[PDB]
Amino acid sequence: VRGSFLDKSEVTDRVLSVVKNFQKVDPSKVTPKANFQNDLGLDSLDSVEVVMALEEEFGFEIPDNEADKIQSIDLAVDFIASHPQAK
Amino acid sequence: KDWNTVFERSINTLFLTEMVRGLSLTLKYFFDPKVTINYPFEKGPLSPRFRGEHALRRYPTGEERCIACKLCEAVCPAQAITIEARTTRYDIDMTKCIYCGFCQEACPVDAIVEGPNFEFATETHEELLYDKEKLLENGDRWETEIAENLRSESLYR
Amino acid sequence: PLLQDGPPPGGFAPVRYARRISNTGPS
Amino acid sequence: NFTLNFGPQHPAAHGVLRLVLEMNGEVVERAEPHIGLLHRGTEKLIEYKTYLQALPYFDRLDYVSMMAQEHAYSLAVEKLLNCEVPLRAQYIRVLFCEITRILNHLLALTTHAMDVGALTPFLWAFEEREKLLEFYERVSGARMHASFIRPGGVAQDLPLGLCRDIDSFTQQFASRIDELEEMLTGNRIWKQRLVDIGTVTAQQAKDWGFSGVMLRGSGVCWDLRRAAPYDVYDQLDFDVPVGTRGDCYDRYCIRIEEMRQSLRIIVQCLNQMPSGMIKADDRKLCPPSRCRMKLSMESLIHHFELYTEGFSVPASSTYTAVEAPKGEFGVFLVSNGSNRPYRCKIRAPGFAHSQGLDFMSKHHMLADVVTIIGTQDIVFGEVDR
Amino acid sequence: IGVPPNSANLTEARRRVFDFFRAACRSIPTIMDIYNLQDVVAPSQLRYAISAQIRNNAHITDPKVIDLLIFKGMEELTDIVDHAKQRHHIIGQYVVG
Amino acid sequence: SGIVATVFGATGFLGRYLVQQLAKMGSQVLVPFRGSEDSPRHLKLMGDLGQVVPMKFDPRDEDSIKAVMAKANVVINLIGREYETRNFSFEDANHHIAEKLALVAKEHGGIMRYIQVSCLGASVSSPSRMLRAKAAAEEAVLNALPEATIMRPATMIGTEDRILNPWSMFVKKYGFLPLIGGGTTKFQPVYVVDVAAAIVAALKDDGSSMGKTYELGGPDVFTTHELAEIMYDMIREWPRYVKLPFPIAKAMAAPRDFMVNKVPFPLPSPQIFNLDQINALTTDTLVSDNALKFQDLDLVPHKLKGYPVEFLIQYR
Amino acid sequence: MRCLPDGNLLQTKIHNIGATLVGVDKFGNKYYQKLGDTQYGRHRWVEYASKDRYNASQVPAEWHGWLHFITDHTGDELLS
Amino acid sequence: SKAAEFVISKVDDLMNWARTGSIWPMTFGLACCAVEMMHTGAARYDLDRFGIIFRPSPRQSDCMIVAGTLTNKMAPALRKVYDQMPEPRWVISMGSCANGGGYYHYSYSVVRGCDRIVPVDIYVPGCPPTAEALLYGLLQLQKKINRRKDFLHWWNK
Amino acid sequence: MDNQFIFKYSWETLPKKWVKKMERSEHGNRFDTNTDYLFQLLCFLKLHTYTRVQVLIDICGVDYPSRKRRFEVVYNLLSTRYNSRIRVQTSADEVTRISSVVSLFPSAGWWEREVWDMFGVSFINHPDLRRILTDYGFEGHPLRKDFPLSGYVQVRYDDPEKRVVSEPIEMTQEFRYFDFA
Amino acid sequence: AKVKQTTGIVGLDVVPNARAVLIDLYSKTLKEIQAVPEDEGYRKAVESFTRQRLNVCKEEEDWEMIEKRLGCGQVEELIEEARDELTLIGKMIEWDPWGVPDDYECEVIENDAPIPKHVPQHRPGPLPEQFYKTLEGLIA
Ligand SMILES: NC(=O)C1=CN([C@@H]2O[C@H](COP(=O)(O)OP(=O)(O)OC[C@H]3O[C@@H](n4cnc5c(N)ncnc54)[C@H](OP(=O)(O)O)[C@@H]3O)[C@@H](O)[C@H]2O)C=CC1
Ligand SMILES: CCCCCCCCCCCC(=O)SCCNC(=O)CCNC(=O)[C@H](O)C(C)(C)COP(=O)(O)O
Ligand code: SF4
Ligand code: SF4
Ligand code: SF4
């Protein structure tokens, strides 16, 4: 059978790895609920960087008026885990 | 508007009447003599003012006319003249030069001129970097025509 | 010198500049 | 919409012409010229030249109408210097300007005609062009880039016998114009290629800065020779042809008529040509005679100064325009008191005309684009500078 | 489409910066294809170079200077994408690979 | 630089890259050519006005040789040929000319640096007659000039190479690519630009390169099958390898070698089925561990994938 | 016999018919004129000494002006 | 080989005769020099009469005339057109701009000579060269083509 | 409509805060205005019955390095209705955007592109503001006085890359500056 | 009284009811200009020439007489100018450029360097008398 949404666990692992290997994120604060700005020492430019990295890894563009709400890993995974364009 | 004018317009359109005149006067030129010049046996007309290949001139004694005043180097719009100094170096980059004749106007002793030669195409760029000895050879080769042209043109300049 | 290139005494002959008609064709 | 990228890398259509067209089938939706392929930094170069050394740059802008740009630059320099030109020089300037206009119109008309497939008029017209190039060479020693018209007048006087040969040319030129016309004017194919092509309203022509034939084709009676006369144009009889439809056919007819009027002006200049000096007599701005410089100290000093430093122009700025064959050609000259122009902005009519190609060619066929380019009379030396 | 007015303050200028950075990053795959870089450099290195260029100017406090820098960056991106001049280890002004 | 270099054999593959690099360093380059004046035409754009000077010479004539060499203090020889013509044998093209050039350089007296370019597999006990002649030429040049420097590049890769281009042509014309030895021979192919850079570096040193032979191999070791795959990734085509055993390949490469020295007219050059190169494919040609590599010239060779094979874009 | 392959030389031989010999230079080039009016009375041309390998640069300076209508003086009068 | 050389020289003479008698230039009409080039092809000089026919496509061309200033923006277009020309091919540089940058030599936007982009066979000096000067340059090209010995060089290779 | 009438009538009718300087001279009538009033002044001159300045002849920049606002932008305009010319000028610096007049004069489009290319002055609301004369990827603004005459880079064919490429300039014979002052 | 067949200007259509159109436009203008302060010179200039033109149009019934007395082009061009003046009156209410600022400075220069007769010079000729009446009324 053919589906339309990526699995939640797969998206969680993918986003976790992307944040872990980014540039300035020690893979010890990276939890499935960790916030970019308050808990990862990332400025707004770096958070935009990470969100743009989320786009390449899942192969689709996230709307600008929607990226403003993806501030942690949980909100991210909530977004990509239900978006049909995700691959 | 009227049956006659409509009929005449129709006939002219159908019979291509206006296309005939173009055919006719194209055919008239067919039998007339041609204006082509049989180069290189025949040449186009030129004037004593023609601005061709530069040349350096000497007095009849054999002494060079140039006294290294550097006026031609100063006026040259293309900066194609390089002089060290009588000159010990006098270079004209024939590929920078715009063949304007300013240098000949500036020269106070009629030393540098643009002579009448226009047939000096080369196979290399370096042959178009004229040095002093080449310019003096040009002057020796074209001296009689250059002098005749100068005699002709001295009544205007 | 005192001789300059110019028109001859009386000027040059008149020249036409306008189109000439041509009524050629049996029509 | 598909995109056809058209660059003719040959003088069939300009040579550096580069067009991006959006098409709906064979219908043109948008024409976008890409220019700068002949941008040579002329305006920057001029700032490093004396006013005399800058003069040859103007021969190379609209390099089909050499002496007209020479004339415009000389006029701007004369205006800033308050320099008085002798009458004989004025007449020679106008005579050569109208010869140039004929040279330009012949080239423009017949290259357009060859573009739309009429081959013979090009050869016929270029023989007459060769005769006019001979007058350029007889006065300057150059067929094209004469650098003959200068601040203060002209470089040299006419050689003996030139006026007679020009008169001989004028006696036969009308028949040549008539032959070109009979080849083109009444031919149904020529009319089908040009009638209602590239229509321009008077409001559009004003909005897009059109000038010359591009403006007069739309019914606007405007010619700088009459609106802002210079040299001896106010002593001369000529008509200003204007169009009624504003299309390519009207502009073709206007160019033919302009050649006829130029012939008229040349005849008048030949008959009214006076004797006297061809250079302004102010001994601080004009070269002395060769014999004077070899005989008189003051003359030698002035010659040395003129050919090394050049003359100075008092600090000021002005815009000067002439009716060039392609339209209004203008120079915005800024002087700082020194011997070199501080700024020289060149206003080329082809720049305005080519900018208008988008609105002119809208909703026309692909084959009409070359027709519209030809009616604009674009030379990229002046467009790009 | 048209050239916008100058940013009134640093907040709106920062917003324009973020928009330019997004537009530059989203054009990376096109650049990789055009210059054939698959076996020469990773896309993230391009992203990193763009962000480093943005960071080296992080001390600017005048919104007009920021607007001009953004305009120049847009022009350079457009020339890189639309009118690519392929060299080998060099894209525009950056040593790649 | 005040170096005046006479580069023999500069109208071939490696010559253009070498002349470009020599002109970059400011050297004056003399380019002897044997045939049409259009053969060195592509070299004239390199360098400034007067810096690159092509000159007609004849190989089988000593006067012309010293004539083109009369103005130089550096001589680089690139002359060689991997096949045979009725006029020039393997030993004639790869040994006699090189020895003659070395002798003329000795009688010249002014040649500070002499560089002779050889092949990596050049040895006396080589299956390839061209490699045997190459080793003989190496010995002859060294005996005539003990201070000369020897380069031994591997199969070179580039826009005008004679390995990837023939493979692409054959594939696009037939649909399949043969493998002469089952696609198992190993070799370290090398970017041609790196070979040119190594020659320039040996010309630039403080004198340490004289008397020594350098083995210039690419960074990586491949099988002929492994290279055929870079060609297919790059030419965006579906691969289809066919095993041609050695005796069969030698059979299909036998006619030209047989009738080249018999028929009195020229033959087309071999692309894939050259007998000598097939013989060379029998053994593996690798850079020896005891030799001098791109290191000891302070150079790192470029990897093949990407830029060295970018010319393969033209075949898609 | 050079007329058959060289049509350029043939045109000169044809137009030499009825022409007047004006002079010969030091290289043996021959100079002819007609005194008519076809190309606006321009009827001066040179027959080069070498019927093959002729080249325009072989016209000496004394005759170059006459050939290009720069002057009405022939090469002989200039040399005297 | 007392008989092979004669036949080879005859073959080469035939090849050179064919290639000199049918030269099909493509014109790169960039600036003012293109106008003098147009005059060369016109009735007075009639390049047609020498067998010279101007072609629109580099694919049918044997020669490229670079007539005018070459800018940095245009250089890639010139090189690509040259690369589409089938062998044998020749390049004529016409005028000071194409030869060495001319009046624009010191500009920030101009290529200082087209021989930086393509190999040049003949340089025609002048600004612009007269139409007759271009014709002389084309006759020099014929002279260069007539030294070719393609068949002999290939026989010996 | 002579230059005395234009000067007097414009003094009487224009809003005072639009014009900082008014010159009457045979070299041309000249109005200087702040950048924020340029658009409105040009619209007034175009639309008003007694001026009818319908043709924008050109726009050009002039560089004055000794000035805090180094650039001066000059608008040359023509009234075919009254056979008169007017010059309107405003000053600008390297970072301050000025208003485009394309919506008033469509001919301004390319002249503004040229000012941006040559001098680096930007134009608000210009629909398509990119370089128009220089080579793609050009850096700098050549008509600035501090930009060197020969520029910074040149191009040549590179056989190993099989393409035309750009390198830093190298001059065989440098431009000689002759100082006659 | 004869209807005009062409204006001779491409894109400028004939307006056969040009008198009524002109009267309506001028009346609209004289109404809408009252939103400008009475002290502003723009308002006085517009009222002056608009009232003169309106009076001419009201008096003359034949458009040829209107064109002749005005000295200002065809009635179609007079309509273009009236519409443009109305448009300008709207933009000027919206811009509110009126009044004089507190620290208002303005440099006048009357440069009198002469220029030669032969250089291009615009010499249109005298305007219709109403232009000078408008100007002198503005000065007074
Ligand atoms: N894969 C490779 O390319 C490898 C090559 N080499 C060797 O390196 C050198 C350069 O290689 P490459 O550039 O590819 O070689 P090419 O075959 O491409 O070029 C050979 C050069 O030598 C000239 N030449 C050949 N035979 C003669 C002859 N009889 N007389 C005079 N000149 C002659 C050619 O002249 P012309 O053009 O006139 O025929 C040409 O200039 C050669 O020695 C080659 O064998 C080393 C290892 C591998
Ligand atoms: C192949 C590439 C093609 C495109 C290349 C384009 C190159 C463009 C080069 C110029 C780009 C710029 O500098 S664009 C101008 C950038 N300058 C500024 O933004 C100054 C203000 N500073 C800040 O906003 C913060 O310091 C900041 C850290 C930035 C974010 O804020 P945070 O701290 O809250 O994260
Ligand atoms: S002709 Fe003009 S550009 Fe050439 S060297 Fe003489 S003065 Fe200089
Ligand atoms: S102007 Fe005449 S005399 Fe002076 S340097 Fe030049 S050539 Fe010699
Ligand atoms: S060489 Fe002279 S005529 Fe030819 S394009 Fe350049 S400037 Fe124009």
Author numbering:
A (entry chain U): 40 to 126
B (entry chain I): 58 to 142, 151 to 222
C (entry chain Z): 19 to 45
D (entry chain D): 10 to 394
E (entry chain W): 10 to 106
F (entry chain P): 67 to 382
G (entry chain q): 31 to 110
H (entry chain B): 62 to 218
Publication passage describing the model:
Here we present the high-resolution electron cryo-microscopy structure of the Arabidopsis respiratory supercomplex consisting of complex I and a complex III dimer, with a total of 68 protein subunits and numerous bound cofactors. We propose that the main role of the plant supercomplex is to stabilize its components in the membrane.
The redox reaction in the peripheral arm is energetically coupled to proton translocation in the membrane arm of complex I. Coupling is based on an aqueous passage that leads from the ubiquinone binding pocket to the ND5 subunit at the tip of the membrane arm.
